[PDB]
């Protein structure tokens, strides 16, 4: 995301968003304009590869989606949401979508390359983040959700795997696959097991409150080293989540435990972020007392950790993945389904 009252700021931000949202960019590049280098990561739906833009010499992260696979996994409308929303947003902590296009077989989304690696790998290696360290990343997510929700957007897949550390040690939110612009309630079952709010698991209509619940899980996992609800199988995780019972590590400060009880709140009439006071219930909470929200947004705060970059094109901060040949059919596939992409 591009680097840099509130009610006024969000007013102008919304104006900018609606313009792109109403008239999305389309077909702004083609496959042969890039040199495919290496796979940076994969999810249930796509493969993201580090690519080299021939003309500019710039390095990018290209997300590749097989149209037939998208259809099989019932992600047609989600994928259209993903591209349409990502090409319209603009925030310091949101990954920037540089180009997008398609061919007979796949869909392509070329984003800025965030070389710091997944928060996930750094978190697992180090074990856990100290409260001040976790707070840093947390604040950025809080501000990012304030921005997204103000645009009537629900994110729906917050997790360390979908969060990247940039060269300045700041967070970049990627993967807008489940992002959706919705005013009222929505019902699709999606997200990641460990991060699902109770209302999603119980097939109830839900709203942006699930994102605040997800934030609770993220903060807990960052500070504890493990999630608040874990098991060997998703079903077992779901049982723990709905029961709501949460136990905190003995090293968790009083302020952190109080905030978490308010975020990992099964009762929607009490879950922070969803109350009458909106996001301020979180931003004014004690655990964030030392947080200077404007400084964070302006990226004037010193990052707790700055990733090592042995130069451009360096992928040492990412695990290695099995590579697969990107074949393109001679026959167009699912043309009608993705006509607006």
């Amino acid at each position: 995301g591009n680097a840099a009252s509130v009610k006024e700021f969000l007013a102008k931000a919304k104006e900018d968003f609606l313009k792109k949202w109403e008239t999305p960019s389309q077909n702004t590049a083609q496959l042969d304009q890039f040199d495919r280098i290496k796979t940076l990561g994969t999810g249930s739906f796509g493969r993201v590869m580090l690519v080299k833009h021939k003309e500019s010499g710039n390095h990018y992260a290209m997300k590749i989606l097989d149209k037939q696979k998208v259809v099989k996994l019932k992600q047609i409308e989600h994928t259209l949401n993903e591209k349409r929303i990502l090409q319209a947003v603009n925030f310091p902590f949101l990954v920037k979508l540089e180009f997008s296009f398609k061919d007979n077989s796949n869909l392509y989304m070329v984003m800025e390359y965030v070389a710091g690696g997944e928060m996930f790998s750094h978190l697992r290696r180090i074990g856990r983040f100290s409260e001040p360290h976790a707070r840093f990343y947390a604040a950025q997510i809080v501000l990012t959700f304030e921005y997204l929700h103000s645009l009537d957007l629900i994110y729906r897949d917050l997790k360390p795997e979908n969060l990247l550390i940039d060269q300045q040690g700041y967070i970049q939110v990627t993967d807008f696959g489940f992002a959706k612009r919705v005013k009222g309630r929505t019902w699709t079952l999606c997200g990641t097991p460990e991060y699902l709010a109770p209302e999603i698991i119980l097939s109830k209509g839900y709203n942006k409150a699930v994102d605040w619940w997800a934030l609770g899980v993220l903060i807990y996992e960052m500070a504890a080293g493990y999630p608040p609800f874990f098991a060997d199988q998703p079903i077992q995780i779901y049982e723990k989540i709905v029961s709501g019972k949460v136990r905190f590590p003995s090293h968790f400060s009083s302020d952190l435990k109080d905030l978490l009880r308010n975020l990992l709140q099964v009762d929607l009439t009490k879950r922070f972020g969803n109350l009458k006071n909106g996001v301020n219930d979180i931003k004014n909470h004690k655990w964030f007392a030392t947080t200077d929200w404007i400084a964070i947004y302006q990226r004037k705060v010193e990052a707790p950790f700055i990733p090592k970059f042995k130069g451009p094109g360096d992928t040492s901060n990412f695990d290695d993945y099995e590579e697969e040949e990107i074949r393109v059919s001679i026959n167009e596939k699912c043309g009608k389904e993705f006509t607006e992409f």
Partner: peptide, 20 residues
């Protein structure tokens, strides 16, 4: 310890997103 239980569990690696 809880950490020991987590580390020994089957979901300590990257977690895939779920859907219908």
């Amino acid at each position: 310890t809880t950490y020991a239980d987590f580390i020994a569990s089957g979901r300590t690696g990257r977690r895939a997103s779920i859907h219908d």
